[PDB]
Amino acid sequence: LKHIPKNISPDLLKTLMEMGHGDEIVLADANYPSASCANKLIRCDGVNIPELLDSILYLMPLDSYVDSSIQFMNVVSGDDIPKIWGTYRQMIEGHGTDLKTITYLRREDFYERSKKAYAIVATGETSLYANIILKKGVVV
Amino acid sequence: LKHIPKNISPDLLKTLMEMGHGDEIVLADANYPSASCANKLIRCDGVNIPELLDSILYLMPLDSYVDSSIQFMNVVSGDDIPKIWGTYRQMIEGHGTDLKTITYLRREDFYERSKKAYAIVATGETSLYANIILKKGVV
Amino acid sequence: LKHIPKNISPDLLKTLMEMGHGDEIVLADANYPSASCANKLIRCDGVNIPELLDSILYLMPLDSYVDSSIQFMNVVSGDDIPKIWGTYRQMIEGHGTDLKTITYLRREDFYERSKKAYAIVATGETSLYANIILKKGVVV
Amino acid sequence: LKHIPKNISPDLLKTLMEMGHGDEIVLADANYPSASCANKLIRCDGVNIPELLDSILYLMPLDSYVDSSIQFMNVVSGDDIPKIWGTYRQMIEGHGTDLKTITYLRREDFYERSKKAYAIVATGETSLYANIILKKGVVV
Amino acid sequence: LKHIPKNISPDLLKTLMEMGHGDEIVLADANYPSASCANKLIRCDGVNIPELLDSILYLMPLDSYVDSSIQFMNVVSGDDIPKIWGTYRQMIEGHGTDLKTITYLRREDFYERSKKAYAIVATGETSLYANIILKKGVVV
Amino acid sequence: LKHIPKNISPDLLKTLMEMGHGDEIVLADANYPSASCANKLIRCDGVNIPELLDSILYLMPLDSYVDSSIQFMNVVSGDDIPKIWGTYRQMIEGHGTDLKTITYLRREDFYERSKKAYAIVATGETSLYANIILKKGVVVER
Amino acid sequence: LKHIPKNISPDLLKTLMEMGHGDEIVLADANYPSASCANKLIRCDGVNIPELLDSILYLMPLDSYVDSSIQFMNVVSGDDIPKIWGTYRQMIEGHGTDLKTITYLRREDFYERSKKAYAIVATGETSLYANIILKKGVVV
Amino acid sequence: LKHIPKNISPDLLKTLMEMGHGDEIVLADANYPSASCANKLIRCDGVNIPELLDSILYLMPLDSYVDSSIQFMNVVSGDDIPKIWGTYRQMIEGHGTDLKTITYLRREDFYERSKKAYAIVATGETSLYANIILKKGVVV
Amino acid sequence: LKHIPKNISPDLLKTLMEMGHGDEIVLADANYPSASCANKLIRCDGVNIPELLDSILYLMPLDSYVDSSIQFMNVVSGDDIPKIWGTYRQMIEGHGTDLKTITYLRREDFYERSKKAYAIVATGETSLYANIILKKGVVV
Amino acid sequence: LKHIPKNISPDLLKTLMEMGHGDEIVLADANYPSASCANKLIRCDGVNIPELLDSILYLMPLDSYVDSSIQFMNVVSGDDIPKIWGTYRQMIEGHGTDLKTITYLRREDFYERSKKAYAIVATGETSLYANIILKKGVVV
Ligand SMILES: C[C@@H]1O[C@H](O)[C@@H](O)[C@H](O)[C@@H]1O
Ligand SMILES: C[C@@H]1O[C@H](O)[C@@H](O)[C@H](O)[C@@H]1O
Ligand SMILES: C[C@@H]1O[C@H](O)[C@@H](O)[C@H](O)[C@@H]1O
Ligand SMILES: C[C@@H]1O[C@H](O)[C@@H](O)[C@H](O)[C@@H]1O
Ligand SMILES: C[C@@H]1O[C@H](O)[C@@H](O)[C@H](O)[C@@H]1O
Ligand SMILES: C[C@@H]1O[C@H](O)[C@@H](O)[C@H](O)[C@@H]1O
Ligand SMILES: C[C@@H]1O[C@H](O)[C@@H](O)[C@H](O)[C@@H]1O
Ligand SMILES: C[C@@H]1O[C@H](O)[C@@H](O)[C@H](O)[C@@H]1O
Ligand SMILES: C[C@@H]1O[C@H](O)[C@@H](O)[C@H](O)[C@@H]1O
Ligand SMILES: C[C@@H]1O[C@H](O)[C@@H](O)[C@H](O)[C@@H]1O
Ligand SMILES: [K+]
Ligand SMILES: [K+]
Ligand SMILES: [K+]
Ligand SMILES: [K+]
Ligand SMILES: [K+]
Known part of the structure; x- marks a missing residue:
């Protein structure tokens, strides 16, 4: 369609x-x-x-x-912090959100909140530890 | 159909x-x-x-x-009481329903009760804290 | 519910x-x-x-x-014209549609039309050749 | 069909x-x-x-x-004891069942039992507190 | 149940x-x-x-x-007239139905009609050419 | 959601x-x-x-x-030409569509084309002969 | 099918x-x-x-x-220990199983175990307390 | 299971x-x-x-x-005759079935008869032109 | 997984x-x-x-x-030959296919063949007339 | 398909x-x-x-x-260590994985683990106690 981001499946938009x-x-x-x-x-x-x-x-x-x-997924000790979080921070600040609202959950805590989430979108992202949890607010 | 409100959908009437x-x-x-x-x-x-x-x-x-x-969903204290509540109230009293039956639920409580409800209709009501739970009487 | 005939079921009203x-x-x-x-x-x-x-x-x-x-379903020429048709005609008139709208269909014509209909209602009507097809008009 | 009561439906019989x-x-x-x-x-x-x-x-x-x-559903005070119970009792004996078999569950207890019941048939009965639960017996 | 023949299964009676x-x-x-x-x-x-x-x-x-x-299934010419047809005739007479109504179809016509029937019941009958097609009448 | 017309339902947008x-x-x-x-x-x-x-x-x-x-659905006489057609015509021109593309179908033909359409949306429109069929065009990268 | 007991239905065999x-x-x-x-x-x-x-x-x-x-279903007093248990033991013995393997469960314990069974087959056995639970072993 | 060929899956045997x-x-x-x-x-x-x-x-x-x-699939008039057909023919006479019942269909005819077939089992057979259509007869 | 091309969804691979x-x-x-x-x-x-x-x-x-x-979709009238056709041609040769195997379909004929295809994958390809139909060959 | 192990079913690969x-x-x-x-x-x-x-x-x-x-299923010792275990070890070491990752689970613990597994693949393996539970790692 016109005016809608090109990388959003019909089904993603619905959800x-x-x-x-x-x-x-x-x-x-x-x-x-x-x-x-x-x-x-x-x-x-x-x-x-x-x-x-x-x-x-x-x-x-x-x-x-x-x-x-x-929320992002905190790493297991010994593993490296993915640099991709810097892209996230850069983007999150872009659409005028305060970067303070990011917190870090550990692997098992994360696995569990995803189960309670309304939807998971399986991406093709190769970067390790790139999982993001987003919480919808009120629409203006 | 004749004699039936025009803003009640087929599936809503069934339910x-x-x-x-x-x-x-x-x-x-x-x-x-x-x-x-x-x-x-x-x-x-x-x-x-x-x-x-x-x-x-x-x-x-x-x-x-x-x-x-x-039931309405109660606002966070001491935020502004939603204006539309008045509209609701003046309509509830009118169908002959005592206003003293309305009750206010914590966001979390309201959610939990909505899950146990028989159905939820999703409306385009743009106003905040505008939700209502209704419990069916006898006919 | 109030104001809705007690003899119309949830699914029938929907349809x-x-x-x-x-x-x-x-x-x-x-x-x-x-x-x-x-x-x-x-x-x-x-x-x-x-x-x-x-x-x-x-x-x-x-x-x-x-x-x-x-449309009523016609008999097989012309043994016992069904008494219930009379009851139908009384109602159909004074509701208030013109009795001249009723045409009578052959068995196999009725069967065939009933398949092209939107829905059929299976009743407990024990009378014979008692079937009816109604066509929805414009609500205003 | 012959020799089957005319007021129990196809899916009711199967049930x-x-x-x-x-x-x-x-x-x-x-x-x-x-x-x-x-x-x-x-x-x-x-x-x-x-x-x-x-x-x-x-x-x-x-x-x-x-x-x-x-089981019947008991009244909450002060509702009328419905007359229909009398019809029920009169009919339950006459099939030979001892009226001592009838017990009376309160509203909330009745609902919870109906939930663990194999099946519920929604009737058109207008009488209040006219609900009945039947427990299937042995055949021979 | 009581009053229902013991060899009609729940789903058969329904159908x-x-x-x-x-x-x-x-x-x-x-x-x-x-x-x-x-x-x-x-x-x-x-x-x-x-x-x-x-x-x-x-x-x-x-x-x-x-x-x-x-309707029964006519045998491919040569092969024996199955005995069971006799048993069926003694079944159909009794219940008061005239054997004049029995017609006989050939394999590829018997198959064709069975496709258009409302139901097929698969039985354990080991005897050949024992298939029967039944057409429902009025209930009064 | 932001930037999306608020009268387009979740399923309609998908479709x-x-x-x-x-x-x-x-x-x-x-x-x-x-x-x-x-x-x-x-x-x-x-x-x-x-x-x-x-x-x-x-x-x-x-x-x-x-x-x-x-396509609109043509009237049978003596029904009136609906006023809403002007409203539609006003709307269509202005989004940049030549009104020459509008044609009109016999009630009967309209029904049949609607059966071959990808979707029908039932609206609350009380106005008569108010049905429209729209055919999706190419979306070209700027 | 050849070499398959005739009294095993298509769907029972698969189960x-x-x-x-x-x-x-x-x-x-x-x-x-x-x-x-x-x-x-x-x-x-x-x-x-x-x-x-x-x-x-x-x-x-x-x-x-x-x-x-x-497991058989044991009787409640004062019902009779049914004759069919005799018929069960050889077959059971006759297929080589040590009858000491038969254990008897009361009614409620039987229903609960059967709810946990992979399947139940509803038979026509008019005899009482004829239910049997079987536990599959190892093949070769 | 005992007394069942070991390379027939639960669903195949049922079908x-x-x-x-x-x-x-x-x-x-x-x-x-x-x-x-x-x-x-x-x-x-x-x-x-x-x-x-x-x-x-x-x-x-x-x-x-x-x-x-x-029915086997006949080869494209260019391609080579498959070794597996000899295996098939030997397999077919071993059980008492005359090789003169075998016929050969060209791909088009094969594709079409397969669509009209009750079932297709997709196997792991590597040999080209290895397909077989079997038509079931009567058990006595 | 290892060894499987990264841009194939689990369902496409299955397909x-x-x-x-x-x-x-x-x-x-x-x-x-x-x-x-x-x-x-x-x-x-x-x-x-x-x-x-x-x-x-x-x-x-x-x-x-x-x-x-x-098969590619031939342009109407009308608009340009899309350059991506060169890109496809460079790939089809190299995997070892003779470019003469490409045919070009009128818009309506392409639509019709796609209704007959086993599957269609909706891509995000913004190039016009970028559609391809591939027919599967034999393996190994 | 090419470059794909021949013994992986379409839905297994998807899984x-x-x-x-x-x-x-x-x-x-x-x-x-x-x-x-x-x-x-x-x-x-x-x-x-x-x-x-x-x-x-x-x-x-x-x-x-x-x-x-x-994880393997341990024997009821009871029975003896099945020789299929060594064959497994020859394999998993040949894929670079250290044999100190194999643990051994009791029959009931293995059943319970398997219920919580993403999928179970039913094989034709005739060896006893031959079951394996694999846990998927990260792909870089
Ligand atoms: C160790 C972590 O496992 C998770 O399942 C993955 O989503 C992360 O990228 C990372 O590999
Ligand atoms: C803050 C509240 O969130 C809730 O989920 C909404 O339903 C209310 O309208 C309000 O926006
Ligand atoms: C001959 C007619 O067949 C129809 O199917 C029935 O609906 C009528 O009652 C009557 O029996
Ligand atoms: C108070 C009782 O509520 C129940 O749900 C109904 O079944 C009774 O008829 C009565 O209305
Ligand atoms: C030759 C005939 O084929 C039919 O399908 C069967 O139903 C008959 O019993 C008979 O075997
Ligand atoms: C007479 C016409 O019937 C059609 O079905 C409707 O869609 C039109 O609006 C109009 O009422
Ligand atoms: C009392 C017992 O009830 C059980 O459900 C039945 O299976 C027995 O045959 C017996 O009637
Ligand atoms: C050329 C033939 O195509 C068919 O579809 C296959 O079934 C045969 O094995 C062979 O490869
Ligand atoms: C005119 C053509 O219509 C097709 O459906 C599209 O797939 C092509 O890219 C092009 O727009
Ligand atoms: C005794 C064990 O039971 C399990 O179910 C089987 O999977 C093993 O192979 C073995 O037979
Ligand atoms: K997708
Ligand atoms: K809606
Ligand atoms: K009903
Ligand atoms: K059965
Ligand atoms: K399989």
């Missing part, structure tokens, strides 16, 4: 539309157990996470009513 | 009809997480709540055997 | 509502092969057709845009 | 047939939350309960292996 | 009641391609046809409005 | 999205046989068609590869 | 086959509540248990890794 | 059982468009055709009412 | 594997009516056709039993 | 692909209760476990983030 204030969506990397965890699965194997996050932030406001609307 | 004494129905605003909470989902994305409440009250009696047959 | 101008519904007697002809089946095995026709006529205008809004 | 020793079936009045409680829902919106109870008892024996094979 | 006037049902021996022909399939692999025929004709009237209300 | 070039969609009025004709049914019982037409024209280009990308 | 070591299948008499207890239901309404048990014991080895691979 | 006189099942090599042509699809991707032909010939009698019970 | 000789798959551009035309629909809204074509040709042989294993 | 880091898959022997334990069942009745394990190890890396990514 973004039907999501209400408080509903969470996981943007999972190519390595995340998306199918096994998901309440509702959306497959987007041909899309990396930076470009997808940008489009969703364009469309979907974030929950200001909580302290933490965005 | 109102099959509802029994005690069953609850949520009238959710545009911002409510309707789809994620619904046991049974009706979308009326083009209808506003006062208008839909009016039609529902005409058709469906409210539960006399409980202290509270109506 | 009456979603019917539009021209759609046909079949009030079928107990002997009619409703299930095998039905595009969409609605069972009301405890209801008779007089009651039902009355309630339906109350909510749903007939099709003014054709010669025939109503 | 009574497939029930076995110990299974319960609720015959619910027009005000019961049948749809929302039913494990399995049979709709008979045109039928009243006394005629239905008569047909079922004809086909289905009641459980002798428990002290209560029938 | 028998769902059937209207003119509807056909095929009683298929254990060599018939039941599953591949059936619009709707009922399996009674442990039942033989003559006893099934008895119960069905007991419960269901035959179509007395057409030339043939019953 | 507008999954439509490609040549696909058609029917905006059916309240009296229309939407449910019986529909390959794929979307119910928007609370929406009027001019509102919906503006939002759809905003997002979805019309098919330039055919003469008629828009 | 027996997809059962692994330790899975249980219940052979239920005509009075049992099979439909309501079953995780997976197979209907063999025209077959008695004796015949069926023989075929199943011909095809399916019994679990030798537990104390008891066969 | 082999529910087939009746005249039904056709296709044994398709790894390269055959099984998924697209199948009315009913059974997958046996780890199984070669000769051993499957063995078991099926053992369990399933072939149709004697036709001159041709078996 | 590719279950396709056999002669089956056709349509790589559809972002303007194609993919959903209304597809018998089986795989969405890859995040992939462009060149990268998809490349990894598909790696896995899947083309049908050499026909003059044309590849 | 392996849709699995993510941490997801488990049971390779279950012919005696295992796959059907009854399986959250998601893939049937591969024709295939043995070593050839299948080998192919899967080629495609799927094992989880490095736990102390044990491979």
Whole structure:
């Protein structure tokens, strides 16, 4: 269609539309157990996470009513911090969100919040530890 | 159809009809997480709540055997009391329903009750904290 | 519910509502092969057709845009003209459609039309050749 | 069909047939939350309960292996004790069942039992507190 | 249940009641391609046809409005006239139906009609050419 | 969501999205046989068609590869020409579509084309002969 | 089919086959509540248990890794220990199983174990307390 | 299970059982468009055709009412004659079936007969032109 | 996974594997009516056709039993020959296919063949007339 | 398809692909209760476990983030150590994985683990105690 971001599947848009204030969506990397965890699965194997996050932030406001609307997955000790978080931070600040609302959950904590999320979008993102949890806010 | 309100959808009327004494129905605003909470989902994305409440009250009696047959979602203290509540109130009293039956639920409590409800209709009501739970009476 | 005839079921009211101008519904007697002809089946095995026709006529205008809004199934020339037709004619008139709209269809014509109808209603009408096809009109 | 009562529906018969020793079936009045409680829902919106109870008892024996094979719904004070109970009792004896088998569950207890029942039939019964639960017996 | 013949399964009785006037049902021996022909399939692999025929004709009237209300499968010329046809005739007479109504179809016509019937019941009947096609009549 | 017309329901947007070039969609009025004709049914019982037409024209280009990308349902005499057709014509021109693309179908023909359409949306439009068929055009990268 | 007991239905064979070591299948008499207890239901309404048990014991080895691979339903006083238990033991002995493997479960314990069984088959066995639970062993 | 050939899956045996006189099942090599042509699809991707032909010939009698019970795919007039046909012919006379019942179809005719067949089993057979159509006969 | 091209969704791979000789798959551009035309629909809204074509040709042989294993959609009138046709041509040669196997279909004929294809994959390819139909060959 | 192990079924490949880091898959022997334990069942009745394990190890890396990514079912000792274990070890070491990751689970613990596995693949492995639980690692 005209005016809608080009990297959003028909089904993704529907689920973004039907999501209400408080509903969470996981943007999972190519390595995340998306199918096994998901309440509702959306497959987007041909899309990396930076470009997808940008489009969703364009469309979907974030929950200001909580302290933490965005969550990443904290690494296991010995593993390196993915540099991709810098792209996320750069993007998140872009659509005028305060970077303070990001918090870090550990692997098992993350796995569990994704199960309670309304949908997981399986991406093709190769970067390790690239999983993002987004919480929908109120629409103006 | 003749003699039936024009803003009650086919599927909404079916579900109102099959509802029994005690069953609850949520009238959710545009911002409510309707789809994620619904046991049974009706979308009326083009209808506003006062208008839909009016039609529902005409058709469906409210539960006399409980202290509270109506619930709103309570605001965070001490934020502004939603203006539309007045509209609702003036319509609830009118169908002959005592205002002292309305009750206010914490966001979390409201969510939990909506999951146990028979159905949630998702409306286009743009106003905040505009949600309502209704409990069916006897006919 | 209030203001809605007590002899119209949840599913029947839904289908009456979603019917539009021209759609046909079949009030079928107990002997009619409703299930095998039905595009969409609605069972009301405890209801008779007089009651039902009355309630339906109350909510749903007939099709003014054709010669025939109503069709009974004809007998096999001409053994015992069914008494129940008389009861139908009384209601159909003073509701208030013109009795001249009723045409009578051959068995195999009726069967065939009933398959092209939107829905059939299986009733408990024990009378013979008691079936009816009604055509929805324009609501204004 | 011949030799089968005319007011029990196709899916109703299959249901009574497939029930076995110990299974319960609720015959619910027009005000019961049948749809929302039913494990399995049979709709008979045109039928009243006394005629239905008569047909079922004809086909289905009641459980002798428990002290209560029938339950009614008790009134909340101050509602009227419905007259229909008298019709029910009069009809339950006359099939030969000892009226001592009838017990009286309060509203909330009744709902919870109907939930663990194999099937609920939503009737057209207008009388209040006209709900019945029947427990299937042994055949031989 | 009480008053229902013991060899009519729950789903068979249902389909028998769902059937209207003119509807056909095929009683298929254990060599018939039941599953591949059936619009709707009922399996009674442990039942033989003559006893099934008895119960069905007991419960269901035959179509007395057409030339043939019953069809068997004619043998491929040469092969023996199956004995069971005798047993069927002594079954059909009794229940008061005239054997003049039995017509005989050839394999590829018997297959064709069975596809258009409302149901095929697959039985355990080991005898050859034991297939019967039944047409439902009026219930009064 | 932001930047999306607020009268386009979640399922309608999906179906507008999954439509490609040549696909058609029917905006059916309240009296229309939407449910019986529909390959794929979307119910928007609370929406009027001019509102919906503006939002759809905003997002979805019309098919330039055919003469008629828009069809109305012609009247039988003596029904009146509906006023809403002006409203539609006003709307269509202004999104940049030549009114020459509008053609008119006999009630009967309209029904049959609606059965071959990708989707019918049932609206709350009480105005008569208010049905439209729109045929999706190519979306070209700027 | 050749070389396959005639009294095993298409769907029963498949269930027996997809059962692994330790899975249980219940052979239920005509009075049992099979439909309501079953995780997976197979209907063999025209077959008695004796015949069926023989075929199943011909095809399916019994679990030798537990104390008891066969459970009958024990009676409640004062009912009679049914004669069919005699018929069961050889077949059972006759297929080579040590009868000490038969353990007896009371009514409620039987229903609960059957709810946990991979499948229940509803038979036509009019005899009482004829239900049997079988536990599949290892093949070679 | 005991007394069942070991290379027939649970679903294959069921489909082999529910087939009746005249039904056709296709044994398709790894390269055959099984998924697209199948009315009913059974997958046996780890199984070669000769051993499957063995078991099926053992369990399933072939149709004697036709001159041709078996169809191979004939080669494209350019391609080479497959070794596997000799295997097949030897397999076919071993059970008492005359090789004169074998016929050969050109791809087009083969594709079409397969669509009209009750089932296609997609096998792992590597040999080209390895496909077989078997038509079931009567069990006595 | 290791060794599988990174831009193939789990479902596309399945589709590719279950396709056999002669089956056709349509790589559809972002303007194609993919959903209304597809018998089986795989969405890859995040992939462009060149990268998809490349990894598909790696896995899947083309049908050499026909003059044309590849079909493009010829432009109307009218507009330019898209440059991506050069890109496809450079890839098709290199994987070892004779470019003469490419034929060009009029818009309506392409649509019609795609209705007959096993599957259509909806890509995010923004180039016009970028659609490709591939026919599967034999393997190894 | 080319470059893909020949013993991986279309849905198995899909399953392996849709699995993510941490997801488990049971390779279950012919005696295992796959059907009854399986959250998601893939049937591969024709295939043995070593050839299948080998192919899967080629495609799927094992989880490095736990102390044990491979589990066998331990013997009831009771029975003796099955020789199929060494064959497994020869394989998993040949794929670069350290044999100190194999743990051993008791029969009941293995059943429970398998219920919580993403998929169970039912094999034709005739070796006893031959079941394997693989846990998927990260792909770099
Ligand atoms: C160790 C982590 O496992 C998770 O499942 C993945 O989603 C992360 O990228 C990372 O590999
Ligand atoms: C803050 C509240 O969030 C809720 O989910 C909404 O339903 C209310 O309208 C309000 O926006
Ligand atoms: C002869 C007629 O057949 C029809 O199917 C029935 O609906 C009528 O009642 C009558 O029996
Ligand atoms: C108070 C009681 O509520 C129940 O649900 C109904 O079944 C009774 O008839 C009565 O209305
Ligand atoms: C030759 C005939 O084929 C039919 O399909 C069977 O139903 C008959 O019993 C007979 O065997
Ligand atoms: C007479 C016409 O019937 C059609 O079905 C409707 O869609 C038109 O709006 C009008 O009412
Ligand atoms: C009392 C027992 O009830 C059980 O459900 C039945 O299976 C027995 O046959 C017996 O009637
Ligand atoms: C050329 C032939 O194509 C067919 O589809 C396949 O089934 C044969 O094995 C062979 O490859
Ligand atoms: C005119 C053509 O229509 C087709 O459906 C599209 O796939 C092409 O890219 C082009 O736009
Ligand atoms: C005793 C064990 O039981 C399990 O179910 C099987 O999977 C093993 O192979 C073995 O037979
Ligand atoms: K996708
Ligand atoms: K809606
Ligand atoms: K009903
Ligand atoms: K059966
Ligand atoms: K398989």
